[PDB]
Amino acid sequence: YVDMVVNAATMMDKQNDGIELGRQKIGVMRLNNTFVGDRTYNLRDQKMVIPGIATAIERLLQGEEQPLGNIVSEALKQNAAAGNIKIVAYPDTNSLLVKGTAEQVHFIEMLVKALDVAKRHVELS
Amino acid sequence: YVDMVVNAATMMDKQNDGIELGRQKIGVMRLNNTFVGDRTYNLRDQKMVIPGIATAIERLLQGEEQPLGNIVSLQEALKQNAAAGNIKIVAYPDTNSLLVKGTAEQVHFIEMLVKALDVAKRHVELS
Amino acid sequence: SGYLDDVVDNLQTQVTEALDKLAAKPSDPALLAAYQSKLSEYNLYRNAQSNTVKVFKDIDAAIIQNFR
Amino acid sequence: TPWSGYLDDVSAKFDTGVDNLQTQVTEALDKLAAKPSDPALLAAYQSKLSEYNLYRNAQSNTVKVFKDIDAAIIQNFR
Amino acid sequence: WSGYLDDVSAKFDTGVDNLQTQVTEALDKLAAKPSDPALLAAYQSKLSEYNLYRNAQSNTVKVFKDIDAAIIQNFR
Amino acid sequence: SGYLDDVSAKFDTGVDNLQTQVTEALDKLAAKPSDPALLAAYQSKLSEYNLYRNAQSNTVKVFKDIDAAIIQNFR
Amino acid sequence: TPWSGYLDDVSAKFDTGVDNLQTQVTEALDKLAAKPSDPALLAAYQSKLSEYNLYRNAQSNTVKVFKDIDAAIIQNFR
Amino acid sequence: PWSGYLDDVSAKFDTGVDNLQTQVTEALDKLAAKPSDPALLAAYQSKLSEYNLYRNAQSNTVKVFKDIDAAIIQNFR
Amino acid sequence: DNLQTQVTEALDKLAAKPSDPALLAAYQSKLSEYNLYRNAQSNTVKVFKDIDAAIIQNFR
Amino acid sequence: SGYLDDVSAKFDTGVDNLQTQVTEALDKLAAKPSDPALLAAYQSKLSEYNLYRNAQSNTVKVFKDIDAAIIQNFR
Amino acid sequence: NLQTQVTEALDKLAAKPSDPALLAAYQSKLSEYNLYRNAQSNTVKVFKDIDAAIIQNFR
Amino acid sequence: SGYLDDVSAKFDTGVDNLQTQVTEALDKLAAKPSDPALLAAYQSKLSEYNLYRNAQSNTVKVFKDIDAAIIQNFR
Amino acid sequence: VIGQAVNIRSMETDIVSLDDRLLQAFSGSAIATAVDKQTITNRIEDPNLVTDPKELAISQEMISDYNLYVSMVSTLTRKGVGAVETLLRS
Amino acid sequence: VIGQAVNIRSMETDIVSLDDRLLQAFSGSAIATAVDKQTITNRIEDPNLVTDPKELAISQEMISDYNLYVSMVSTLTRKGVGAVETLLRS
Amino acid sequence: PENAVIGQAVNIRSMETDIVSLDDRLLQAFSGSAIATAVDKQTITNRIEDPNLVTDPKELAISQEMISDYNLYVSMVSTLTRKGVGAVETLLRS
Amino acid sequence: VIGQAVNIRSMETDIVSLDDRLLQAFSGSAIATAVDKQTITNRIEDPNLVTDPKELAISQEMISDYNLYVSMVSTLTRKGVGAVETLLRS
Secondary structure, eight states, rough: HHHHHHHHHHOOOOTTTTOOOOOBBEEEEEEEESSOOOOOOTTTEEEEEEHHHHHHHHHTTTTTOSSSOOOOOOOOGGOOGGGGOOEEEEETTTTEEOOOOOOOHHHHHHHHHTTTOOOOOOOOO | OOOHHHHHHHHHHHHHHHHOOOOOEEEEESSSSSSSSSSEESSSSOEEEEEEEHHHHHHHHOOOOBOOOOOOOOHHHHHOOGGGGGOOOEEEGGGGEEEEEEEEEEEEHHHHHHHHHOOOOOOOOOO | OOOOOOOOOOHHHHHHHHHHHHHOTTOHHHHHHHHHHHHHHHHHHHHHHHHHHHHHHHHHHHHHHHOO | OOOOOOOHHHHHHHHHHHHHHHHHHHHHHHHHOOOTOOHHHHHHHHHHHHHHHHHHHHHHHHHHHHHHHHHHHHHOOO | OOHHHHHHHHHHHTTTTTHHHHHHHHHHHHOOOOOOOOHHHHHHHHHHHHHHHHHHHHHHHHHHHHHHHHHHHHHH | OOOHEEEEEEETTSSSSHHHHHHHHHHHHHHOOOOOHHHHHHHHHHHHHHHHHHHHHHHHHHHHHHHHHHHHHTO | OOOOOSSSHHHHHHHHHSHHHHHHHHHHHHHHOOOOOHHHHHHHHHHHHHHHHHHHHHHHHHHHHEEEHHHHHHHOOO | OOOOOOHHHHHHHHTSSTTHHHHHHHHHHHTTTTOOOOOHHHHHHHHHHHHHHHHHHHHHHHHHHHHHHHHHHHHGG | OOHHHHHHHHHHHHOOOTOHHHHHHHHHHHHHHHHHHHHHHHHHHHHHHHHHEEEEEEHH | HHHHHHHHHHHHHHHSSSHHHHHHHHHHHHHHHHHHHHHHHHHHHHHHHHHHHHEEEHHHHHHHHHHHHHTTHHH | HHHHHHHHHHHHHHTTOHHHHHHHHHHHHHHHHHHHHHHHHHHHHHHHHHHHHHHHHHO | EEEEEEHHHHHHHHHHSSSHHHHHHHHHHSSSSHHHHHHHHHHHHHHHHHHHHHHHHHHHHHHHHHHHHHHHHHH | OTTOOOOOOOOOOSOOOOOGGGGGOOOOHHHHHHHHHHOSSSSOOOOOOOTTTTTTTHHHHHHHHHHHHHHHHHHHHHHHHHHHHHHHOO | OOOOOOOTTTSSSOOHHHHHHHHHHHHHHHHHHHHHHHHHHHHHHHHSSSHHHHHHHHHHHHHHHHHHHHHHHHHHHHHHEEEEEHHOOO | OOOOOOOSSSSOOOGGGGOSSHHHHHHHHHHHHHHHHHHHHHHHHHHHTTTTTTTTTTHHHHHHHHHHHHHHHHHHHHHHHHHHHHHHHHHHOO | OOOOOOOOOOOOOOOOSSSHHHHHHHHHHHHHHHHHHHHHHHTTTTHHHHHHHHHHHHHHHHHHHHHHHHHHHHHHHHHHHHHHHHHHHH
């Protein structure tokens, strides 16, 4: 009995090692208050370039090993590396495409909404 | 009896190892609300480029190893565990349509995404 | 093996598998660099095993000869 | 299937990068040969030909560098 | 499950955090616009750095195999 | 036959068609030695060949030395 | 942080050393393109294009020299 | 008389450029008579350039196979 | 185990920036010294125990 | 410590400042790449550095070989 | 002895590694030193092997 | 001093005055860098010096190999 | 660090299970099973496996052990006969 | 696949004397060896076979197999003779 | 451990007492030697099967010693046993 | 040089019988052997001495002399015991 139990358990264990359990999901997030693309202004004597949200976030996360958490102003599946997160701007609808794990997508969304705040108009005389 | 069962079962297993069971489906999808290709606007003072869906998705999935799922806005698992980086999309302008190569599941997810992205645009009159 | 008769994985498997993967694309540096160290570790293992088996047999031969 | 190695893919990455230069060069040439004395055609050809030159050079130098990495690794199997 | 010459290779592969992907990225960008001097200048650096990485890795594993084989030869 | 031929063959069943492709590309190039389109392809194929043949031969050498050691320790 | 080696540090020293040249060049080009016949724009473009050319040359020549020095040491580990 | 393999690799080029080896000497023998004819200069520039490329590619190709073969033969030890 | 520790330190510093010539120059030396040390130790251990075996074989 | 380290360090003390003369002359040049007096200054420092490193490495190599050849005869 | 001559040639070289006259002198000295050390070690070994073989013969 | 020193010194005595001629002509040139007579005089001297040093070093190299190859066979 | 353990009070042997394999000189049944397998084989599977390093490392054990077993029996019989002759003369 | 042949029922109702078993073994080995040596030498002489990578890669395997076979026959023979000496030698 | 030193207060030895028989004194020797050798052989084998031990110079240097010490131990037990029985034989045939 | 001392006067003893001449020759050899072995072991682990050609050239000799000396003492002891055994057997 002992020998049957032991061998059956070990071989059922080995027949699963090739199975992968992690997965990737895609989040589509419209920007309500600002242009997705990088902005550039041409002036009589000057050229100015301003990076977009996608550019800034990518430039921040690039190369990160640790998972993210707590954005402020079996579980092995959970511990996806932050560097896997990818962001692509889609100006045609003024929206962001995000690829990664669900918690990552969540955090990114929170960060985006922390950032797309509408501007106050100023008149100068 | 035990020796013949052990032998036969093992030799059958090794005869089957070489059979390839994965299949590649082709889906054809028409766009209804937008042009398929990329568009460049040659403004009097500025050159501006807008990438098409095909480009943007092929850029998003680039080199991905894990499978796709849950998109939002015995052998079964072995087949399902198909890499994202194998999805291929070719824009066909002549009929304003996309050609998509992937597994049936991938094709389905891609289609759902497409239908999330070709929304019709509003008009604005400026005076 | 698929078989146990009632009464992890070794370097021999890992080498055969890395050779098998390499031979599909002999010019990829990641695969080459992954294979150099497996072929080296297999060479060292397979030498050290045989040398010690040889030592234990020469010990027993010397015992039998000493009591001849 | 037509087998293709790693260097094959490195080479082909350029060909798929430059979508159509390969034929624009020939059409520009034919147009020029029809009317060698038109400045607009001369100016177009100078650009396309230069671009083609630089593409071919970058391609062959990268392929050689990767060959010389791999040879230096498979040396050490001994 | 692995030996000690894999621990020695992996010390390089985890040492140069990201270069292995950065090269492919740089090539993907340059392939799109070979005539751009800023891209060319970037790629020269990445490709050279990668070439040295691989050479130093392979020569170090060769040396440790030469030490081990000589100790094992004395088991006789 | 033998195991060292098994190792040698595990390469040749790995590179499906290269052995042919190289000679075919050579014939094309020899037909028009000055076409850069042909030249560029031949450089690649020839390099892939040079590497395949070197890796094969060094591996066969190593497995030969492992067996020659064991057959001496039989004594 | 994006990992950077030594070669890409030496290379970056030039980039931050010439603070703004990279943009000054294109600004001067857009003015020149707006009015090619103005000699005051011409004589200003010449100096910038020349500075740019020299900068890029020195940069890559230095990177190559260092790579040669390192490869010559790594050759002696064996 | 025994042809090896390198001989065959070389002869592939010779039997490729079937007539270029004559055309070069005939276009030269035209030009040397009247060096000022633009038609003849234009012709000879082409045939000379072709002959240069052909001899160069031939010699490099023979060298690569010589280097593969030696590297195999060194393992007979 | 001092000369065993020094080489593993040097290797980490090098692996951090494989192209720095000062680090390369240091590592070359450390690795060479370690390489000589191991060989010398193994060879003398062998000599010392071949002498014992030859003694026993002399009376055996 | 060790003896090869003393050999290697003897060069470092022979050239007092070179390792940071190069880094300084580079930092000066990078500010004004077109000044010919700066270019001419940098060319010699970088040459000197190149030779220094080559000699340093090859000497350590020769001494290694002599030691390994002696240790081979303990057996 | 040769040990000192080589040590001093090295000290003079490391003062100015770029001087050809110093380099040429060092190449020669280091070469001769290398040969000397090898020849000495091989001869010592040979004599000891002979000595050992005699004992093994009468043992 | 061994035999290799002798072989080196045969070159040193075979060229009588070259080292000082080079040192001199350099200082004459550096006094007036734009005189064609001095330039022409210098090119030849420096070329001769270059070949001299190269031949010397390659010869010492060959002899070292012949000696080490003999010494190896003492065992 | 990880998974560390030590037995403090007593030297209970644990690297091996102590067993009757202490009390025998040759595992004659393991010899008789291996010698069976390398002799029942007559035109089945294949010959000449001089060359694969994994089976060639299994043959080394058998080729040595059977030579030792046969060498031992040669001495035991001489000893036995010599003991009988010793008693009968004396 | 070319010219394959196998004997059946080799020992089923006839058995050879050891005197003959040794003699057949010796002959079948000695001729195979001499033919393999000639094959190698011929593959070296022919100018078309020593200059083609495809043919050299085949010849390396032949030399390796010949060397391993002759070494294994020699070692086993020496070891088997040793046992008869230890049996007969007083 | 490495950061600890552990002595014995004073080494009194009950086993210095001869009190057991000349044959119990033999059985102790036999039993202890048989266990020691079986343990040593097993340990040496494990040190080779395990891939991180058989490929690190630090570990190989130790295994070399283990093998040599095993060899010397067994060779000496064999020698002394032969010398012992040979004495008995020499006297009784005289 | 630094921190160095030498014993000037050896203690002394009477030597009156073959017994004391024997114990004395034994004790004289034992200590010289232990000292030599320790010295060599240290010379193999001071890193200034393991890596310097001049110091390695010395260690080589020390090892050789040790080997020869212990082999001589072993041989002559066994020859003496064998001569006693031969005469008493005769």
